[PDB]
């Protein structure tokens, strides 16, 4: 099984590649423009680094789709300010360039495992966002923050249509704030790591304040990467072909917190940490979609999966690794 | 005495007016296309031919100027090189009006640089134009004091007033003939280039007084001194210097005081990005600053 | 002023062409695959028939965009059953082929006057649908009727983006149930005529029943083509360039009726008609988005326009012309 | 009395200064981003919050203004519609300062239109803001004469001076309460829209006096009245009217006189295209004109 | 013999088409975007009007090259002010679009008869400009008037190279101020009519002044279209294949005059004309490459041609026809 | 700053790469079909060898333009006999293939630093060839040696036009007989090394005669590569953006010599050299554009540059290195 990861040089690429290389029947083709995040797999016999950029290359990516069996496109900009500061580039990369890769899979009859986004639900009023039943709610066109949500949704619909009409084999997945070791940088155009926890950990690391937009009462769910990657690994395995044509939220709905509470949890774990003294004093909380909890019935059904790691162990492990790998001279 | 004049800005306008009041016959005025007076409008109004070529250092212009047969040439804040092939056409020579106490501050923007450097005085100098730019002998020099509260625009008006006073007596003197000029001593000269946006960038590790002078040097209508709050640019339009924290850190937000390498700088008024000007306290909130 | 109408062989094409030919400074290029609906303009010196099909032609349409000054793309399928029976074809024609025409306008710096749809608002809860402020509400992806609404909306957003980023000059318009003489056939892929009144008039003409889906309590607004075409004509004139980058609902919000009431109005006008005896007895009302009223402030502002024809005169005129032109031998 | 002010340009600046001198508490100033004074800079300097949204007719701004609890609202040359949902927030009402003898010249650019139409008088009017723009009852109106040699800029300064005089006494009067206002008679109203480049196009078949007024109406710093010599645009910056040829034809080139429908117009100064301003005689040569 | 004239709706197209239709073995395909200048040939059995534009069409022009035997590309902007006001468009049309047509001829092994320009010689100091021996002299790059001259010259060199390397059959011709009935409009992008005489006749017709740039002492040669078209017709006939690979100046070197003298000649012929009273009084001479005389040895050798019409008869005939066809109500 | 050198495997590539790698903020991408001339940089962390050929590759070069910031295209044939023996290939490579690279820079908004040629001035009669004022003089089309000069000039004009119309950032440079260590081979299609000194040194090395075409009285200027590369390095640095849109002669106008004198200087330096005995006796001088001196005011102004190395030290250093690296067994 040849697995093509586009945008391997990051969080998901790292953790997914580790997982697949444990198993004896995977060849991982990791496409990216750099390899610093995964440099320890470069010498692995079943890892294959592929030089590339999905905006520049046509034929090279197309080739690698043909060569491989399953494809995971992880290249996208999901930086909120960018939705308003550089909307065209968000659209071009996240929509147009990924659409080309989708069409390569259709053409060579390959399976695609596509990262949809939890942002597709928008201001959905269900308490549990359900992939198969929840209505998707966005604001008017004069609220440009929604361009990312709606680009990703239209891409889902296009995948769905290729599936219905052209026999594309797909699974869509929606990560909810995955977190752990080897988080993407905040401005890396790679899907997967919780931007909210990376930002907060960054605040503590830099000694900048934690912004609570309107008191930080908006609630989010957070998912350990060990749980998340286990689910994604099962989607890849696709026991019984039970993931075919499915849309699967992957998150831990019991790991719910407002940004305020997430703030306090991180701070507690931080102040307790043996390396805390390398970092500045706490600059403080700064007052400047109200809920986003996944239904995980689809993951229960298709993957026989449920999350095993509590909030506190994921927080602690995520923070610990981040602090330990910070370069203190830079 | 007939003359060909190169002029721009308020200094250009007052120089033309002074030549006219002194009885000079202005055959043509060379200026530039664009708060100050327009030399072109003044020329157009006085019925004096006016040209604004981007570059006169070409035989086309040498010949046009030669045909005008100037006895003398004057440069009043013209911004480009006027090469010797042109200046040598005037038997009585060429004279330039420069806004500094030459030999100090030769070059560009002496109005701003004297404020940047916290000088307590500056002046206007009328000098002969020789091969080397801004280095010719001095016909007369008039000093003015720079007050602690002067900013670029108030100093500009003082310089223009001094220029008017200087020209009113020196232009008739030149009309009478060569004046014994005062040589500039090269070892005492200083030269400045055109200011780049980087030259008005506030670096908080510096003394508050130096930063305050920078604010004064490019205050409105000039572009303003600027810095960043992370990735957000802001401009400090007016400031005040105040007599134990990281430089650049916020000491207080109302009034907005920023710690400097020495002392603190109060941002009295400023703006965030291309936003509107506001009092420092409001700017602090706009920028998300806290003590 | 060279006006390129793509899909001229219909309701809007007819009425727009009539209007522009009254004025002495218009050359109308009417592109279509047939000319029966506009055959009386074929000999007009300032009308130019152009053979074409926006799914088949590339270069020929591109040429005519370059040749002309302003472009009105009226080719789209807006037949509700088709949204569910032939969704891919609705998407391909309405979205993909119109997107090509948009890009031709961008490339040759031509003005585009684009028919958005009142369906973009979806289940918006505002009483008056406002182009600049109303949120757009659709159902989940498992409700495929929304594919038309969302395709048209994404096209609006793409036009908007070309406008912002590439200096495209556009006006978007949204017709609300325009009606009058020379209605499109129910299955013609041309935008403009109220499918609800065409269907009902057809019921009376054929002697089939009028379907009131859940009692026909859903309310719609209806607009005489004389009012509608006047507005569209003013968008073309673009006095003061006041229509640049604007989105304009064109409807009469006082002409509100449920399908039931529209039913009774038509029936009354029908039973009173001197040619009623050529048509079968009334087969009856058959019980089998709840409101869709436009805000018209944008049309007031940009066009100085307000609708002048009451419900009853539009109903009567629309019915009268339909009946009179029916071929009774076929 | 607390107030929220909408202001721009010199009128905006003097209105703010007058409110401050009359003891009003200005909670916020709404203005616009861009030779006149900057309302934003004045606000920033006086420590008054200032906002420049492109459009305030939205609930976001209604709520922000409501929170400021103004007793009264003033509009001093603000250029956009301030809808009633905002104006009704002020129990004492909203008042607008308009540069004409209302009901005449409601609308845009009354400064320029009164010159275009050759009026011999104009004025400033402070009036209540009602549903209908520029039609509310008059608190006070002060007339000024327009001199034959006034141009847009000199008339502008006279209007500002009149506005200062009017506000100095009426603002304190408003502070004391409702004033019996003078209704505008609709049958006597006239309204003008924003001027387009076409509105300053000189058509030679018209009387020289009318064209002369057009030149005066948009003289520098305004865009200038213009025409074409074939396909070459030129601007007439200043002119003179003179008392038997095709309109638009050149009567003489020095001075440059153009025949009009009646009388002749001398182009005293002007420019060709985006070239520099010059005397009419030179402009004639530049444009290739001959008698 | 199928002759393809690109840009037939003008001076050369008219006179060439007349000439070829006199002969019984020509089929003329006249390509253009309008037909008003040649409308009297539209019904001729051996004339074939072809709709087209060399900047818009690719395949349609290519087709017609394949269908035909010989090709005459007459579309180019040669309006001096345009060289400086719209240099890019002059380059794109005159160079790039004509280069495509050249390559079509190369590909389908067709003969091309290409209008080079007398402007290629530039400031050549020979008294007689010689196609085979005279050096070409232009100014620096900072004198943009030369962009037209140098674009045309490079096109000649490219034709020459295709001839040498790829067996292209070509003849290049250089007209020197051809004149007669049916002059092109001054801003028509069609080669052939003397812009200097059209301008002057226009001055007299409009009552504008005749501009003598620096006294109008620069000397030019003028050629009656009956002489010119006879030469071009012989190039088409190509007796003995003697025109293969040749460059041929076509002008009358004895019809030499400064612009001043040309001015006076026209004025004399004008004042004498029976329709002169329909035109304004003379506005006068207005003081505001010094010689351009062709060598015609190549035309002597290849075509056995020499010009037969004196200056005065060409002037008189050219003026007479112009005045007689002016629309006096417009 | 990512610097893309196309044709790095030569003289300029070597010396430029050395210079840029001294500085800490350059990444050099050196594109070529071989690496023998630069093999000592292959292991450098900030040098990146790129396999390529500008006639074969489209997408690969395009990619590397996008990836990089500034581009230096050094691939061209400037071998005089080739201008007449293989003119089409000189045109195709030097003009057509470089034009593609120019258009890649335009498209991705990259800066281009382009080697124009001193041959553009041709037979200009100014004593000092001035980039901004000197007229360019070439012979008739029947003198095919000028095809190289005119191809390069037209390329300059096309660059200039992209600059004016499309915001291309460019600097053009004109080297005058740069010389030093690691000279290109005489038939390498890479710009930069003086073909006149390479030939002469080759004569001495081989024991062939030095050809003085008509006595070798034609005068040339010669420039040490340390001076030349310093200038080029400053163009890359572009202090104050003072090189934007500029054309810069880079030569030493005081290093003037006829070919005869250059001959004698080389011979003197040769006969004095400790390795002279490995080479044959002098075969002698053989009798078989008259001046080409650069104005360097643009380099003075933009770069604050003036040449520092005298004729004799450059001659000696150039010869010394050549002799020392000759393979005496081959």
CB contact under 8 A, A288 and B290: no
**In 3D, which of A56, F84, A67, D3 has the Cα closest to residue A75?**
A56
CA-to-CA distance for E233 and E301, rounded, in angstroms? 15
Contacts for A258 with CB less than 8 Å, ≥ 6 apart: A216, A217, A218, A219, A220
Mutation target for C interface from E56, E60, E63, E92: give the one with most C CBs within 10 A: E56
Q: Quick check: B276 contacting A, CB < 8 Å?
A: no
Q: Which residues of A touch F2 (CB under 8 A)?
A: none
CA distance linking residue D73 with residue D58, whole number of Å = 17
The residue to which tokens 């200048």 are assigned: E37
Whether the Cβ atoms of residue C258 and residue C221 lie closer than 8 Å to each other: no
Q: Quick count: other Cβ atoms within 10 Å of Cβ F167?
A: 9
Instruction: Give me the numbers of helices (H) and strands (E) for chain B, helices first please.
Output: 8, 15
End-to-end Cα distance, chain C: 41
Cβ(F5)–Cβ(F75) under 8 Å? no
Quick check: helix, strand or coil at residue A237? helix
Separation CA C242–CA C221 (nearest Å) = 26
Q: Is A245 helix (H, G, I), strand (E, B) or coil?
A: coil
Phi, psi for residue C296 in degrees, rounded to 5: -120, 20
Q: B129 vs B76, B84, E29, CA distance in Å?
A: 12, 9, 71
Q: Show the tokens assigned to D211.
A: 């064209």
Strands E170-175 and E246-250: parallel
Closest CA to E99 of E157, E148, E52: E157
Pairing of β D25-30 and β D50-51: parallel
Task: For helices E195-206 and E311-325, give the axis angle rounded to 10 degrees.
Answer: 50
Tell if the CB–CB gap between E161 and F88 is shorter than 8 Å: yes
Burial-class residue B132 by CB neighbours within 10 Å (0-12, 13-18, 19+): exposed
Q: What angle do CA D117, D121, D126 make, to 5 degrees?
A: 110
Q: Is the domain covering E1-193+223-253+289-307 a CATH 3.40.50.720 domain?
A: yes
Give the integer Cα–Cα distance in Å for C111 and C171. 8
Under a CB-based contact definition with an 8 Å cutoff, are residues B125 and B97 in contact? yes
- Asked if D219 reaches chain B (Cβ–Cβ under 8 Å), the answer is no
Element (H, E) at B220: none
The span from the CA of F203 to the CA of F214, in Å, is 18
Beta partners for residue F246, in sequence order:
F171
- Residue E222's alpha-carbon distances to E197, E211, E267, F118, in angstroms, are 9, 18, 16, 40
Please enumerate in sequence order all residues whose Cβ is within 8 A of that of E68, keeping only pairs 6 or more positions apart, or say none.
Answer: E2, E3, E4, E29, E110
- A42 interfaces chain F, CB cutoff of 8 Å: no
Provide the shortest C-alpha distance from residue C93 to chain A (in Å). Answer: 15
- Residue E119 a catalytic site member: yes
| Minimum Cα–Cα distance from C62: chain E residue | E56
Structure tokens at A225: 């990467």
> How many C-beta neighbours within 10 Å does residue D91 have?
9
Name which of B8, B4, B11 is nearest B166 in CA terms. Answer: B11
Q: Which residue of B has its CA nearest to A288?
A: B288
Helix, strand, or coil (residue D163): helix
Q: Do A140 and C139 touch (CB under 8 A)?
A: no
Interchain pair A134, C140: CB under 8 A: yes
Torsion over CA: A103, A105, A109, A115 (sign): negative
One-letter-per-residue 3-state SS of chain F? CEEEEECCCCHHHHHHHHHHHHCCCCEEEEEECCCHHHHHHCCCCCEEEEECCCCCCCHHHHHHHHHCCEEEECECCCCHHHHHHCHHHHHHHHHHHHHHHHHHHHHCCCEEEEECCHHHHECCCCCCECCCCCCCECCCCCCHHHHHHHHHHHHHHHHHHHHHHHCCCEEEEEECCEECCCCCCCCCCECCECHHHHHHHHHHHHCCCEEEHHHCCCEEECEEHHHHHHHHHHHHHCHHHCCCCEEEEECCCCCEEEHHHHHHHHHHHHHCCCCHHHCCCCCCEEECCCCCCECCHHHHHHHCCCCCCCHHHHHHHHHHHHHHHCCCCC
Phi/psi at B256 (5° precision): -80, 110
Q: Which of E119, E131, E230, E246 is catalytic?
A: E119
CB count in 10 Å sphere of residue F10: 26
CB A259 within 8 A of CB A195: no
Contacts of E186 (CB under 8 A, 6+ apart): E79, E195, E198, E199, E202
The rounded distance, in Å, linking the Cα atoms of C249 and C133 is: 12
Residues of chain A with Cβ-Cβ distance to F59 below 8 Å are 58-59
Indicate the SS3 state at residue E321: helix
Q: How far apart are CA D9 and CA D159, in angstroms?
A: 13
Distance CA E49, CA E26 (A): 14
CB atoms within 10 A of CB F261: 15
Terminal alpha carbon distance of chain D: 66
- Check CB contact under 8 Å for E136 and F133: no
C157–A147 C-beta distance less than 8 A? yes
Neighbours of chain D (3+ CB pairs under 8 A): B, E
Identify the closest residue of chain D to B255 by CA–CA distance.
D47
**If we measure between CA atoms, which residue out of C295, C307, C305 comes closest to residue C133?**
C295
Alpha-carbon span B78 to B40, nearest angstrom:
12
Whether C167 contacts chain A with CB within 8 A: no
User: What values do phi and psi take at D220, rounded to 5?
Assistant: -50, 140
Q: Do E288 and D288 touch (CB under 8 A)?
A: yes
User: What is the CATH architecture of A194-222+254-288+308-330?
Assistant: Alpha-Beta Complex (3.90)
Residue F228 makes CB contacts below 8 A (sequence gap 6+) with F15, F175, F178, F250, F251
Experimental resolution (Å)? 6.6
Flag if D50 and B271 touch (Cβ within 8 Å). no
> CA F197 to CA F202: how far, in whole Å?
8
- The answer to whether C9 and C35 have CB atoms below 8 angstroms apart is yes
**How far apart (Å, rounded) are the C-alpha atoms in residues D135 and D183?**
8
Terminal-residue alpha carbon distance, chain F: 41
Write phi, then psi, for B4 (nearest 5 degrees).
Answer: -115, 130
E254 in active site: no
d(CA E172, CA E245): 8
Cβ contact, residue pair A58, F59, below 8 Å: yes
Alpha helix ranges (H) inside chain B: 9-21, 39-46, 59-68, 84-87, 110-116, 152-175, 208-217, 280-286
Compute the Cα dihedral for C90, C93, C98, C100 and give only its sign: positive
Catalytic residue among A119, A230, A246, A317: A119
Per-residue CA distances from B56 to B78, C73, C225, F133, F299 (Å): 11, 55, 66, 14, 20
Token pair listed for E176: 């020197």
Encoding tokens for residue B135? 């280095």
Chains contacting B (3+ CB pairs below 8 angstroms): A, D
CA E14 to chain CA mean position, Å: 12
Q: Which of C82, C97, C111, C119 is catalytic?
A: C119
Q: How far apart are CA E318 and CA E309, in angstroms?
A: 12
Query: Helix or strand or coil: residue D49?
Result: coil
Cα angle: D3, vertex D5, D8; to 5 degrees: 160
Q: Tell me, what DSSP letter sits at residue E97? A: I
Residues of chain F with CATH 3.40.50.720: 1-193+223-253+289-307
Report which DSSP code applies to A127: S
* CB proximity list for A322: less than 8 A, separation 6 or greater: A181, A183, A201, A205
SS3 B56: coil
* Interface residue A85 vs chain B (CB under 8 A): no
Query: Which class for A42: exposed (0-12), middle (13-18), buried (19 or more C-beta within 10 A)?
Result: exposed
Dist. CA E86–CA E97, nearest whole Å: 16
CA distances from E309 to E14, E22, E234, E251, F12 (A): 20, 21, 17, 11, 62
Which E-chain residues 7-46 have CB contacts (< 8 A) with chain D? none
- Residue E116 phi/psi, 5-degree rounding, is -75, -165
The segment(s) of chain F belonging to CATH 3.90.25.10 are: 194-222+254-288+308-330
Q: What experiment produced this structure?
A: cryo-EM
The burial class, CB within 10 Å (0-12 / 13-18 / 19+), for B261 is: middle
Judge: C138–A139 Cβ closer than 8 Å, yes or no: no
How many other β-carbons are positioned within 10 Å of the β-carbon of residue D20?
15
DSSP H or E run through D146: none
Upstream peptide bond of B255 is cis (omega within 30 degrees of 0): yes
DSSP state letter for E134 = P
**Of E131, E174, E292, E317, which one is the catalytic site residue?**
E292
Q: What is the crossing angle of helices F311-325 and F259-271, to 10°? A: 60
The verdict on C67 touching E (C-beta cutoff 8 Å) is yes
To the nearest whole angstrom, how far is the Cα of F165 from the nearest Cα of chain E? 8
Kindly tell me the burial class for residue B33, based on how many C-beta atoms sit within 10 Å of its own C-beta (0-12, 13-18, 19 or more): exposed
Q: Is A233 strand, coil or helix? A: helix
């Amino acid at each position: 099984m040849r697995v093509l990861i586009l945008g391997v040089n990051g969080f998901i690429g790292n953790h997914l590649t580790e997982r697949l290389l444990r198993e004896d029947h995977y060849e991982v083709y990791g496409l990216d423009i750099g390899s610093d995040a995964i440099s320890r797999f470069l010498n692995h016999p079943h890892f294959h680094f592929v030089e590339g950029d999905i905006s520049i290359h046509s034929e090279w990516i197309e080739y690698h789709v043909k060569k491989c069996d399953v494809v995971l496109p992880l290249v996208a900009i999901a930086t909120p300010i960018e939705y308003t500061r550089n909307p065209l580039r968000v659209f071009e990369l996240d929509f147009e360039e990924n659409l080309r890769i989708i069409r390569y899979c259709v053409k060579y009859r390959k399976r695609i495992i596509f990262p949809s986004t939890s942002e597709v639900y928008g201001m959905c009023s269900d308490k549990y966002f359900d992939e198969d039943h929840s209505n998707l709610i966005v604001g008017p066109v004069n609220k440009p923050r929604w361009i990312y949500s709606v680009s990703k949704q239209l891409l889902d619909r296009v995948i769905w249509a290729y599936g219905e009409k052209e026999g594309l084999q797909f699974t869509l997945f929606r990560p909810f704030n995955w977190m752990g070791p080897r988080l993407d940088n905040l401005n890396a155009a790679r899907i997967g790591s919780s931007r909210a926890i990376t930002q907060l950990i960054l605040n503590l690391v830099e000694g900048s304040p934690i912004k609570l937009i309107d008191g930080g009462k908006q609630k989010r769910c957070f998912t350990d990467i060990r749980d998340g990657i286990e689910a994604l690994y099962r989607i890849i395995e696709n026991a019984g072909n039970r993931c075919d044509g499915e849309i699967i939220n992957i998150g831990n709905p019991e790991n719910e917190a407002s940004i305020e509470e997430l703030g306090e949890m991180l701070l507690a774990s931080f102040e307790k940490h043996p390396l805390r003294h390398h970092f500045p004093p706490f600059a403080g909380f700064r007052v400047v979609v109200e809920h986003r909890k996944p239904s995980i019935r689809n993951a229960h059904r298709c993957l026989d999966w449920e999350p095993k790691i509590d909030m506190q162990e994921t927080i602690d492990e995520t923070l610990d690794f981040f602090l330990r790998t910070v370069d203190l001279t830079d | 005495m007939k003359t060909v004049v190169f002029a721009y800005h308020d200094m250009g306008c007052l120089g033309i007016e002074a030549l006219l009041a002194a009885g000079y016959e202005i055959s043509a005025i060379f200026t530039h296309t664009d708060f100050y007076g327009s030399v072109a409008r003044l020329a157009a109004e006085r019925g004096i031919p006016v040209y604004a070529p981007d570059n006169v250092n070409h035989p086309l212009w040498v010949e046009r100027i030669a045909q005008l047969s100037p006895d003398v040439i004057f440069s009043f804040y013209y911004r480009h090189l006027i090469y010797d092939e042109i200046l040598q056409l005037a038997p009585a020579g060429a004279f330039n009006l420069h806004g500094s106490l030459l030999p100090k501050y030769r070059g560009r923007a002496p109005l701003n640089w004297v404020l940047v450097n916290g000088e307590t005085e500056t002046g206007v100098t009328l000098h002969r134009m020789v091969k080397r730019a801004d280095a010719g002998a001095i016909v007369a020099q008039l000093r003015i004091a720079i007050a602690p509260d002067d900013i670029a625009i108030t100093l500009h008006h003082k310089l223009c007033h001094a220029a008017r006073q200087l020209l009113e007596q020196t232009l008739p003197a030149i009309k009478h003939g060569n004046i014994l000029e005062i040589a500039q001593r090269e070892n005492e000269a200083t030269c400045f280039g055109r200011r780049t946006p980087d030259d008005s960038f506030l670096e908080w590790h510096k003394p508050a007084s130096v930063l305050h002078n920078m604010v004064r040097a490019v205050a409105d209508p000039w572009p303003g001194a600027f810095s960043y709050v992370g990735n957000q640019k802001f401009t400090v339009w007016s400031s005040r210097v105040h007599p134990k924290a990281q430089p650049g850190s916020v000491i207080s937000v109302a009034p907005l005081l920023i710690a400097c390498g020495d002392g603190a700088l109060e941002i009295v008024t400023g703006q965030a990005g291309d936003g509107i000007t506001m009092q420092g306290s409001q700017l602090a909130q706009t920028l998300g600053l806290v003590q």
